[PDB]
Amino acid sequence: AISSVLNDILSRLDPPEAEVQIDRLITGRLQSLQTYVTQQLIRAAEIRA
Amino acid sequence: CPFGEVFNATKFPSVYAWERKKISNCVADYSVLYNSTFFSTFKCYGVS
Amino acid sequence: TDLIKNQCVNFNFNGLTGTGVLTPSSKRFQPFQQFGRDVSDFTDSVRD
Numbered sequence: 516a517i518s519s520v521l522n523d524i525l526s527r528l529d530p531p532e533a534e535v536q537i538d539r540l541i542t543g544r545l546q547s548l549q550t551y552v553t554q555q556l557i558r559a560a561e562i563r564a
Numbered sequence: 565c566p567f568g569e570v571f572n573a574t575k576f577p578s579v580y581a582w583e584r585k586k587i588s589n590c591v592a593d594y595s596v597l598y599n600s601t602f603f604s605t606f607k608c609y610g611v612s
Numbered sequence: 613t614d615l616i617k618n619q620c621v622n623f624n625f626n627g628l629t630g631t632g633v634l635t636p637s638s639k640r641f642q643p644f645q646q647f648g649r650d651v652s653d654f655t656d657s658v659r660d
């Protein structure tokens with residue numbers, strides 16, 4: 516993306532095109548959340564043991 | 565800012581010897597050359 | 613406009629926008645610094 520900062524895309528970039536930049540950034544970030552939670556479940560299982 | 569001296573300049577340089585000037589210290593209205601066509605080519609990037 | 617402090621506001625500084633709560637600070641900036649950031653790359657404080 517142009518910038519990791521959402522505001523630096525949405526603020527200055529033309530609203531049409533901006534959706535492309537934003538959508539890309541969203542996908543990127545969602546992937547880290549999915550990764551994070553997956554690992555936490557695994558760690559939790561170890562704690563249960 | 566004296567954009568008049570940029571777009572309404574009497575003389576322009578050749579491309580092999582393109583020239584540059586610094587523009588500063590003002591309040592600039594950018595709609596003047598945008599919402600009123602004065603160009604055959606108008607392409608901006610990064611910022612609308 | 614004037615400043616609105618100690619409450620959630622919409623802000624627009626000289627190239628920096630967003631929302632939040634504006635408070636005075638004791639951060640020591642250098643003579644050549646406009647704003648600073650947190651450990652994570654997000655705006656922490658701004659020079660008026």
Ligand SMILES: *[C@@H]1O[C@H](CO)[C@@H](O[C@@H]2O[C@H](CO)[C@@H](O[C@@H]3O[C@H](CO)[C@@H](O)[C@H](O)[C@@H]3O)[C@H](O)[C@H]2NC(C)=O)[C@H](O)[C@H]1NC(C)=O
Pocket residue numbers: 567568571572602
């Ligand atoms: C460079 O100078 C030219 C003129 O020498 C400027 O273009 C002219 O700008 C006027 C202002 O909008 C345009 O509209 C005119 O308004 C008057 C108002 O009464 C009207 O009587 C005229 O018939 C006309 O509507 C005019 O069409 C326009 N001319 C051209 C060829 O574009 C130009 O904007 C200046 N550029 C800069 C950067 O200053």
Ligand SMILES: *[C@@H]1O[C@H](CO)[C@@H](O)[C@H](O)[C@H]1NC(C)=O
Pocket residue numbers: 595596599600
């Ligand atoms: C186009 O720019 C001029 C600059 O003075 C402004 O007055 C005019 O209202 C603008 N047109 C539109 C549709 O915003």
